[PDB]
Paper text:
To import molecules that are too large for diffusion through outer-membrane porins, bacteria employ a diverse family of membrane proteins termed [name]-dependent transporters. These transporters in the outer membrane are so named because they engage in active transport, the energy for which is provided by the [name]–ExbBD complex in the inner membrane, which spans the periplasm to interact with TBDTs. The final TBDT possessed by [name] K12 is [name], and the substrate of this transporter remains unknown. The homolog of [name] in Salmonella enterica ssp. enterica serovar Typhi (Salmonella Typhi) has been shown to be important for virulence in a mouse model of infection.
The diffraction from [name] crystals exhibited significant anisotropy. Diffraction data were processed and scaled anisotropically using the diffraction anisotropy server with a final maximum resolution of between 2.96 and 3.5 Å, depending on the reciprocal-lattice direction. However, this solution did not provide sufficient phasing power for model improvement. To obtain experimental phases, [name] crystals were soaked with potassium tetranitroplatinate and anomalous diffraction data were collected to 3.5 Å resolution. Phases were obtained for this data set using single-wavelength anomalous dispersion phasing in combination with molecular replacement using the FecA-derived model (MR-SAD). The structure of [name] was then built and refined using the anisotropically truncated native data. The DALI server was utilized to search the PDB for structural homologues of [name], revealing that the closest structural homologue to [name] is FecA, which is consistent with our sequence analysis. We determined the crystal structure of [name], demonstrating that it possesses a compact positively charged extracellular substrate-binding site that is characteristic of TBDTs that import negatively charged small-molecule substrates. Based on its compact positively charged extracellular binding site, the substrate of [name] is likely to be relatively small and negatively charged.
Numbering used by the authors: 40 to 190, 192 to 231, 233 to 372, 379 to 699
């Protein structure tokens, strides 16, 4: 796991946990270049997450990227993803792979992110963590982690974590309640190993919603429709995963990973009463009950014929079957009335793949991989009323995704690389559902997006840190956009190309006395090359969500036995919220400071810390609902907030 193969960046857990609420990924990995993450502070929705513009256009979920929590997929076959599962009080590391090689990781993999949980070791240590922040937020958690032996057959290892978090919300109708349970266990079968994962999330959050420009300027914490319709969500999910690994040959390894999980959600929307009267409308309440399961097999043969070549092959099967329903708001009233939608939508994914690393010469290697994505959608519709036809339908998609990188080592401390690949974006099941034709059935004409990505990078170990550089462009084509939309049913279309250019620069350094410095910047000019609007020429326009410029810089003094401190700074360029480029979110800069003491006397380790976020009380909006239907894009953010945390660790 070294910064050297490609444009890959790895963030450590104990540092992502250092004087932080341990709630949102945003607070931790906000500095990875090319990775745009913003915390909506709305636990009825997901983080605004994107990689080099991938998934930026997404409105309510995360799309166009790949996320794995302990090898369990967080993005579904169709590309839709979520973020509520991550327990930051028990994370080992987060690896982000951006660039063409992300295409190895599924259908809509413009960039793949992999979260893995702590392994546990000697001694059996128990931790009690607590944090309290402004606007009535507070979180606590217990983590027990240890091992039965050294690290041998029979040697077992355990890590359990539970956390509970509740907030009264900065803005009206935003209080949330979130409980996490995350466990990981391992047993050494022989010198062949095994592992189990158990994930559980339970959220009951009020969705504040968005605010229109006039509404945000007038009052920042206002949530007019929030209490009018009781906009809120409740999420519950449990995942079980199982992984086996065994070294067959002295030079050939192999592994298999399978997962089973169940998600269940309820969303009360702020949809008015008039539009729902049309018999074809789906309602104002969305109910979703999905089962997902999958199996992934990998064979890594370090056998070398032709040159020193190590290659990995494998097969992946992913399955998600959902029963989806909809309801009224009438009795808009806060509870749900007559049933107005019913379906079973299955989506499953099959595809082989393989990567190879050839050490053609010394200080020059060629990495190359391919994958054949095959995705199937079926919808069995159960709602056929006089006006709402039988919308059942079925479709499939296939594509060859290839990727490759040439790596040349100027030294062992400096390696440069050049990579390229093609990408793929299937239409979501929600996108095919309806057609502007008016005929009953799926819109079988819609085809997926094509990519065309090129990148160069230079990774240099200087001092005890690393300086990485990367430059990239992406050719999007057949972008899936909206065509018609009336009577509560949105229809989609293929129209237009796009081009997205950008650059990433990062530098990390550490010095004796643990003086640590970190910096990074990222440029992204993502423009359209074709009209993607029925009534307006949107050709030259920006891409909404992407920040033309962003940057991060932090400096920290971290002694191991006493007073520690640090301070961060984050710059976010002006980001457009429309395809037409009708609205913009301000360019804003935000500062943060923190101090604390780490008293570790023999077994007990008591860590105490305080935090000032948004030190200069800058007023801003840190999230936007891209392409909101009615123009309510803005999601304001609090000003100069604080937090304080206390952690206790006892070692056995
Ligand atoms: C290791 C197993 C890899 C191949 C797994 C293929 C299993 C997918 O099987 C599919 O299941 C769907 C419902 O679940 C059915 O609708 C399809 O008829 C069937 O092909
Ligand atoms: Ca129907």
């Amino acid at each position: 796991e070294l910064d050297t193969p490609a444009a890959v960046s790895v963030v450590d857990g104990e540092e992502m946990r250092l004087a932080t609420p341990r709630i949102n990924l945003s607070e931790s990995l906000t500095g990875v270049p090319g990775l745009q993450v913003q915390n909506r502070q709305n636990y009825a929705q997901d983080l605004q997450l994107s990689i080099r513009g991938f998934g930026s256009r997404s409105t309510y979920g995360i799309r166009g990227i790949r996320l794995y929590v302990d090898g369990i997929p967080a993005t579904m076959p169709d590309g839709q993803g979520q973020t509520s599962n991550i327990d930051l009080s028990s994370v080992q590391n987060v690896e982000v792979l951006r660039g063409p090689f992300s295409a190895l990781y599924g259908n809509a993999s413009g960039g793949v992110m992999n979260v893995t949980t702590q392994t546990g070791q000697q001694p059996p240590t128990i931790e009690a963590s607590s944090y309290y922040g402004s606007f009535g937020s507070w979180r606590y958690g217990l983590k027990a982690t240890g091992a039965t032996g050294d690290g041998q057959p029979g040697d077992v290892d355990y890590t359990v974590s539970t956390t509970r978090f509740t907030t009264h919300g900065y803005r009206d109708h935003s209080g949330a309640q979130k409980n996490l349970a995350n466990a990981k266990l391992g047993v050494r079968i022989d010198e062949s190993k095994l592992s189990l994962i158990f994930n559980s999330v339970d959220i009951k959050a009020d969705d504040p919603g968005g605010l229109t420009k006039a509404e945000w300027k007038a009052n920042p914490q206002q949530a007019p429709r929030a209490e009018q319709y009781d906009t809120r969500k409740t999420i519950k999910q449990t995942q079980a995963g199982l992984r086996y690994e065994r070294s067959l040959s002295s030079r050939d390894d192999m592994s298999v990973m399978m997962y089973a999980g169940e998600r269940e959600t309820t969303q009360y929307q702020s949809i008015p009463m008039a539009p729902q009267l049309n018999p074809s409308h789906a309602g104002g309440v969305i109910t979703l009950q999905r089962h997902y399961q999958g199996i992934d097999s990998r064979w890594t043969h370090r056998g070398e014929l032709g040159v020193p070549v190590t290659f990995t092959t494998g097969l992946n099967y992913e399955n998600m079957s959902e029963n989806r329903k909809g309801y009224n708001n009438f009795r808009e009233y806060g509870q749900k009335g007559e049933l107005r939608r019913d379906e079973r939508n299955l989506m499953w994914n099959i595809d082989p793949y393989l990567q190879t690393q050839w050490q053609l010469s010394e200080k020059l290697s060629l990495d190359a991989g391919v994958r054949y994505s095959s995705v199937w959608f079926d919808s069995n519709d159960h709602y056929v009323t006089p006006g709402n036809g039988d919308d059942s339908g079925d479709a499939s998609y296939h594509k060859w995704l290839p990727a490759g990188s040439l790596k040349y080592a100027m030294t062992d401390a400096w390696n440069i690389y050049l990579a390229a690949g093609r990408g793929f974006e299937t239409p979501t099941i929600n996108e095919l559902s309806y057609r502007a034709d008016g005929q009953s059935g799926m819109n079988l004409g819609l085809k997926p997006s094509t990519n065309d990505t090129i990148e160069i990078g230079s990774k240099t170990r200087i001092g005890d840190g690393l300086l990485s550089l990367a430059l990239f462009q992406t050719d999007t084509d057949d972008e899936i956009v909206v065509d018609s939309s009336s009577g509560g049913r949105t229809t989609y279309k293929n129209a237009g190309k796009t081009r997205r250019q950008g650059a990433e620069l990062a530098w990390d350094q550490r010095f004796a006395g643990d003086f640590r410095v970190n910096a990074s910047w990222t440029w992204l000019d993502a423009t359209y090359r074709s009209n993607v609007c029925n009534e307006q020429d949107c050709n030259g326009n920006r891409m909404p969500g992407i920040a033309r410029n962003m940057g991060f810089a932090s400096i920290g003094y971290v002694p191991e036995d006493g007073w520690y401190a640090g301070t961060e700074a984050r710059y976010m360029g002006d980001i457009m919220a429309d395809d037409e480029n009708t609205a913009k979110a301000p360019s804003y800069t935000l500062v943060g400071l923190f101090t604390g003491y780490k008293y570790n006397y023999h077994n007990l380790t008591v860590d105490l810390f305080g935090r000032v976020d948004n030190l200069f009380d800058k007023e801003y909006v840190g999230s936007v609902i891209v392409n909101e239907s009615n123009g309510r894009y803005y999601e304001p953010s609090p000003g100069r907030n604080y937090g304080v945390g206390m952690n206790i660790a006892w070692r056995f």
